[PDB]
CSV table of C-alpha atoms in Angstrom, one decimal:
chain,number,residue,atom,x,y,z
A,913,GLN,CA,-10.7,10.9,-14.9
A,914,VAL,CA,-7.0,10.2,-14.1
A,915,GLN,CA,-5.2,7.2,-16.0
A,916,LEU,CA,-1.7,6.5,-17.5
A,917,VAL,CA,-1.6,4.3,-20.5
A,918,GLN,CA,1.3,2.4,-21.4
A,919,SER,CA,3.2,0.8,-24.9
A,920,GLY,CA,2.8,-2.9,-26.1
A,921,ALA,CA,4.6,-6.1,-24.3
A,922,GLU,CA,7.2,-6.9,-26.0
A,923,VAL,CA,10.4,-9.4,-26.3
A,924,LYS,CA,13.6,-9.4,-25.8
A,925,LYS,CA,16.7,-10.8,-26.4
A,926,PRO,CA,19.5,-10.5,-24.4
A,927,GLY,CA,22.1,-7.0,-24.7
A,928,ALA,CA,18.9,-4.9,-26.3
A,929,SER,CA,17.7,-2.4,-24.8
A,930,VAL,CA,13.3,-2.2,-24.8
A,931,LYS,CA,11.7,1.5,-24.0
A,932,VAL,CA,8.6,1.6,-22.0
A,933,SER,CA,5.6,4.7,-22.5
A,934,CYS,CA,3.5,6.3,-20.5
A,935,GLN,CA,0.9,8.3,-21.4
A,936,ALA,CA,-0.9,9.8,-18.7
A,937,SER,CA,-4.9,11.6,-19.5
A,938,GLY,CA,-7.3,13.1,-17.5
A,939,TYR,CA,-5.0,15.7,-16.3
A,940,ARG,CA,-1.9,18.1,-15.6
A,941,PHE,CA,1.1,16.3,-16.5
A,942,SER,CA,3.4,18.4,-15.3
A,943,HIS,CA,2.4,18.5,-11.8
A,944,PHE,CA,3.0,15.4,-10.5
A,945,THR,CA,5.6,13.0,-10.7
A,946,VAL,CA,6.1,9.8,-12.4
A,947,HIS,CA,7.2,7.0,-10.9
A,948,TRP,CA,8.6,3.5,-12.3
A,949,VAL,CA,7.7,0.4,-11.3
A,950,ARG,CA,8.9,-3.1,-12.1
A,951,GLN,CA,7.9,-6.7,-11.0
A,952,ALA,CA,9.3,-9.5,-11.5
A,953,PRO,CA,7.1,-12.9,-11.4
A,954,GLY,CA,7.9,-14.5,-8.1
A,955,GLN,CA,8.9,-12.1,-6.2
A,956,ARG,CA,8.0,-8.1,-4.8
A,957,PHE,CA,7.4,-4.6,-7.1
A,958,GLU,CA,10.5,-2.9,-7.4
A,959,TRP,CA,10.5,0.5,-7.1
A,960,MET,CA,13.2,1.7,-9.9
A,961,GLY,CA,12.8,5.4,-9.7
A,962,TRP,CA,11.1,8.4,-10.1
A,963,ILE,CA,10.7,12.1,-12.6
A,964,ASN,CA,9.0,15.0,-12.1
A,965,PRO,CA,8.5,16.7,-14.9
A,966,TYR,CA,8.3,20.0,-13.8
A,967,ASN,CA,11.7,20.5,-13.1
A,968,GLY,CA,13.3,17.4,-14.4
A,969,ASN,CA,14.5,16.2,-11.1
A,970,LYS,CA,15.4,12.3,-11.0
A,971,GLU,CA,15.7,10.1,-8.6
A,972,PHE,CA,17.6,7.0,-9.1
A,973,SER,CA,17.0,3.1,-7.1
A,974,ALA,CA,21.0,2.3,-6.9
A,975,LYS,CA,19.8,-1.1,-8.5
A,976,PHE,CA,19.3,0.5,-11.3
A,977,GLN,CA,20.6,4.0,-11.5
A,978,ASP,CA,23.9,3.1,-14.4
A,979,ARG,CA,20.9,1.1,-16.9
A,980,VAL,CA,18.4,3.2,-16.5
A,981,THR,CA,16.7,6.8,-18.6
A,982,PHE,CA,14.2,8.4,-17.9
A,983,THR,CA,12.9,11.1,-19.7
A,984,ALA,CA,9.5,12.4,-20.2
A,985,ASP,CA,8.0,15.2,-22.8
A,986,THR,CA,5.5,17.1,-21.3
A,987,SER,CA,3.3,18.4,-24.9
A,988,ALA,CA,2.8,14.6,-25.6
A,989,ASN,CA,2.2,14.5,-22.0
A,990,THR,CA,4.3,11.2,-21.9
A,991,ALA,CA,6.7,9.7,-19.7
A,992,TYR,CA,8.9,7.5,-20.7
A,993,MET,CA,12.1,4.9,-19.5
A,994,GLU,CA,14.3,3.5,-20.9
A,995,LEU,CA,16.6,0.0,-19.5
A,996,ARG,CA,20.1,-1.1,-21.4
A,997,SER,CA,21.1,-4.4,-21.4
A,998,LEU,CA,18.6,-6.1,-20.8
A,999,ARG,CA,19.3,-10.1,-18.7
A,1000,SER,CA,17.3,-12.8,-18.1
A,1001,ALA,CA,16.6,-10.9,-15.0
A,1002,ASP,CA,14.9,-8.1,-16.7
A,1003,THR,CA,11.8,-10.4,-17.0
A,1004,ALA,CA,8.8,-8.5,-15.9
A,1005,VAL,CA,5.9,-6.5,-15.6
A,1006,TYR,CA,6.7,-2.9,-15.8
A,1007,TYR,CA,4.4,0.1,-14.9
A,1008,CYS,CA,4.1,3.5,-14.3
A,1009,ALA,CA,2.7,6.3,-11.0
A,1010,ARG,CA,1.6,9.1,-10.9
A,1011,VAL,CA,2.2,10.4,-7.3
A,1012,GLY,CA,-0.4,11.6,-5.0
A,1013,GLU,CA,-2.4,15.0,-5.2
A,1014,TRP,CA,-0.6,17.6,-2.1
A,1015,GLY,CA,-2.6,17.4,0.9
A,1016,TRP,CA,-3.2,20.1,3.2
A,1017,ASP,CA,-1.2,19.3,6.0
A,1018,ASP,CA,1.6,16.8,4.2
A,1019,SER,CA,5.3,17.2,5.1
A,1020,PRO,CA,7.3,17.2,2.1
A,1021,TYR,CA,6.9,13.5,0.1
A,1022,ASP,CA,3.9,12.6,1.5
A,1023,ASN,CA,1.9,12.2,-1.4
A,1024,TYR,CA,5.2,10.3,-3.2
A,1025,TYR,CA,2.6,6.9,-2.2
A,1026,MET,CA,1.8,5.5,-6.1
A,1027,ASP,CA,-1.5,7.3,-5.9
A,1028,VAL,CA,-2.8,6.1,-10.3
A,1029,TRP,CA,-1.1,2.7,-11.9
A,1030,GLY,CA,-0.7,2.2,-15.5
A,1031,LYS,CA,-1.7,-0.7,-16.9
A,1032,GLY,CA,2.0,-2.2,-17.3
A,1033,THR,CA,3.1,-3.5,-19.9
A,1034,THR,CA,5.0,-7.3,-20.1
A,1035,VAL,CA,9.3,-7.7,-21.2
A,1036,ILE,CA,9.8,-11.0,-21.4
A,1037,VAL,CA,13.9,-11.7,-21.8
A,1038,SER,CA,15.7,-15.3,-23.7
A,1039,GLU,CA,17.2,-0.5,4.7
A,1040,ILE,CA,13.2,-1.2,5.4
A,1041,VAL,CA,11.6,-4.7,5.0
A,1042,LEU,CA,8.5,-5.1,4.9
A,1043,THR,CA,6.6,-8.6,6.2
A,1044,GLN,CA,3.1,-9.6,5.4
A,1045,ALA,CA,1.2,-12.1,7.2
A,1046,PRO,CA,-0.2,-14.4,6.4
A,1047,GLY,CA,0.5,-15.1,2.9
A,1048,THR,CA,-2.9,-16.3,1.7
A,1049,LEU,CA,-6.5,-15.9,3.6
A,1050,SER,CA,-9.2,-17.6,2.5
A,1051,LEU,CA,-13.3,-16.1,3.4
A,1052,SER,CA,-16.5,-15.8,2.6
A,1053,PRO,CA,-18.6,-13.3,1.7
A,1054,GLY,CA,-19.3,-11.8,4.3
A,1055,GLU,CA,-16.5,-12.1,6.8
A,1056,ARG,CA,-14.1,-9.7,8.7
A,1057,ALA,CA,-9.8,-9.4,6.6
A,1058,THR,CA,-7.0,-8.4,8.4
A,1059,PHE,CA,-4.0,-8.2,7.1
A,1060,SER,CA,-0.7,-7.4,8.6
A,1061,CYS,CA,2.3,-5.7,7.7
A,1062,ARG,CA,5.6,-5.5,10.8
A,1063,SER,CA,8.2,-3.7,9.0
A,1064,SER,CA,11.4,-3.3,10.5
A,1065,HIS,CA,12.2,-0.3,11.4
A,1066,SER,CA,9.7,2.5,12.8
A,1067,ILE,CA,7.9,4.2,10.5
A,1068,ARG,CA,7.7,7.2,12.4
A,1069,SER,CA,7.0,8.9,9.3
A,1070,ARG,CA,3.0,7.2,8.8
A,1071,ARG,CA,3.9,7.1,5.1
A,1072,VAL,CA,2.7,3.4,5.0
A,1073,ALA,CA,-0.2,2.3,2.2
A,1074,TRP,CA,-2.2,-0.2,1.0
A,1075,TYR,CA,-2.4,-1.4,-2.6
A,1076,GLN,CA,-5.3,-4.0,-4.1
A,1077,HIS,CA,-4.0,-5.8,-7.6
A,1078,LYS,CA,-6.2,-8.3,-9.6
A,1079,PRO,CA,-3.8,-9.5,-12.2
A,1080,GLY,CA,-4.5,-8.6,-15.7
A,1081,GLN,CA,-5.3,-4.7,-14.1
A,1082,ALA,CA,-3.6,-1.4,-12.5
A,1083,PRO,CA,-2.9,-2.0,-9.3
A,1084,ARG,CA,-5.3,0.4,-7.3
A,1085,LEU,CA,-4.2,2.3,-3.9
A,1086,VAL,CA,-6.7,1.4,-1.0
A,1087,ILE,CA,-4.9,3.5,1.8
A,1088,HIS,CA,-2.0,6.7,2.1
A,1089,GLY,CA,-0.4,7.2,4.8
A,1090,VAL,CA,-1.6,4.8,6.6
A,1091,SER,CA,-5.6,5.8,7.6
A,1092,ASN,CA,-6.5,7.7,4.8
A,1093,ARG,CA,-9.0,5.7,2.2
A,1094,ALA,CA,-8.4,7.0,-1.1
A,1095,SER,CA,-10.6,8.3,-3.2
A,1096,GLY,CA,-13.6,5.7,-3.8
A,1097,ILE,CA,-12.3,3.0,-2.1
A,1098,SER,CA,-15.3,1.8,0.2
A,1099,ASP,CA,-16.6,2.3,3.9
A,1100,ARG,CA,-15.3,-0.8,3.7
A,1101,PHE,CA,-11.8,-0.1,4.5
A,1102,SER,CA,-10.0,0.8,6.4
A,1103,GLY,CA,-5.8,0.9,7.8
A,1104,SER,CA,-4.1,1.1,11.6
A,1105,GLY,CA,-1.3,0.7,13.5
A,1106,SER,CA,1.8,2.7,14.3
A,1107,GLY,CA,6.0,1.9,14.8
A,1108,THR,CA,6.2,-1.4,13.2
A,1109,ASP,CA,2.8,-3.1,12.6
A,1110,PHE,CA,0.7,-1.9,10.4
A,1111,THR,CA,-2.8,-3.0,9.7
A,1112,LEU,CA,-5.2,-3.0,7.0
A,1113,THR,CA,-9.0,-4.4,7.1
A,1114,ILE,CA,-11.8,-5.1,5.6
A,1115,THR,CA,-14.7,-5.4,7.5
A,1116,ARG,CA,-17.0,-7.0,5.4
A,1117,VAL,CA,-16.2,-8.7,2.5
A,1118,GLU,CA,-17.2,-8.4,-1.2
A,1119,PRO,CA,-16.6,-10.6,-4.1
A,1120,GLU,CA,-15.3,-7.6,-6.0
A,1121,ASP,CA,-12.5,-8.2,-2.9
A,1122,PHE,CA,-11.0,-10.4,-3.7
A,1123,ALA,CA,-7.1,-9.9,-4.7
A,1124,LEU,CA,-3.3,-9.7,-3.8
A,1125,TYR,CA,-2.5,-7.2,-1.4
A,1126,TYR,CA,0.5,-5.3,-0.5
A,1127,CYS,CA,1.6,-2.6,1.8
A,1128,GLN,CA,4.5,0.0,1.0
A,1129,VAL,CA,6.3,2.4,3.0
A,1130,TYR,CA,7.5,5.5,0.8
A,1131,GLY,CA,9.5,8.7,0.7
A,1132,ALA,CA,11.9,10.6,-0.7
A,1133,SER,CA,13.9,8.3,-1.8
A,1134,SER,CA,13.6,5.4,-0.5
A,1135,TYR,CA,10.3,2.4,-1.5
A,1136,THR,CA,9.8,-1.0,-0.1
A,1137,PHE,CA,6.4,-3.9,-0.7
A,1138,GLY,CA,6.0,-6.4,1.1
A,1139,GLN,CA,5.6,-9.8,-1.1
A,1140,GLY,CA,2.0,-9.4,-0.8
A,1141,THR,CA,-1.2,-11.7,1.2
A,1142,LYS,CA,-3.6,-13.8,-0.8
A,1143,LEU,CA,-7.7,-13.3,-0.5
A,1144,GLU,CA,-8.9,-15.7,-2.4
A,1145,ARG,CA,-12.4,-17.1,-1.6
């Protein structure tokens, strides 16, 4: 099945640059745009940009356009990301993520959620807002869990997605398009909402469910994540 395998962690001095590779297997590499996303210690996930290997289109976050270069090598099934002039605030885990498969009713960009993540590569160097609640949420297997996400703008387009993260492993997509449960995701999970307030719900909690949960608004040129809700046992 679909898999994105990244290069190894690195230690870098200030001034250096770092090149992270991302090799795809289990599908046709050039038929899916790849996002690049990072997370600095105790910060929100932060989108850097995407590349579409089919036609060479690139989209860049303004925070990173000066310092980053995306490339692709379709013979090698590999996507690359290079960041120059590293500084302290560049310590982070860097992820690649493939967009979703096109939906039979989709509008332009309805599939640009992060559908499959690589495990991430750690690099150590020597305007919509989403707010989630509660910050933490303690429960025993069996109970109902309810996650909230409030947007500052109305998300008329219904491009809200929810991700599950157990640090070390790759984030998994749980819900995209507000209410669509992603493949292989249990019946226990469902999302909902509109305009400004969205919710992820788990009817009965299994032990495999304890992790962090992030909501996201996605689109063509902007992606923002909530700060995350911790589901501890």
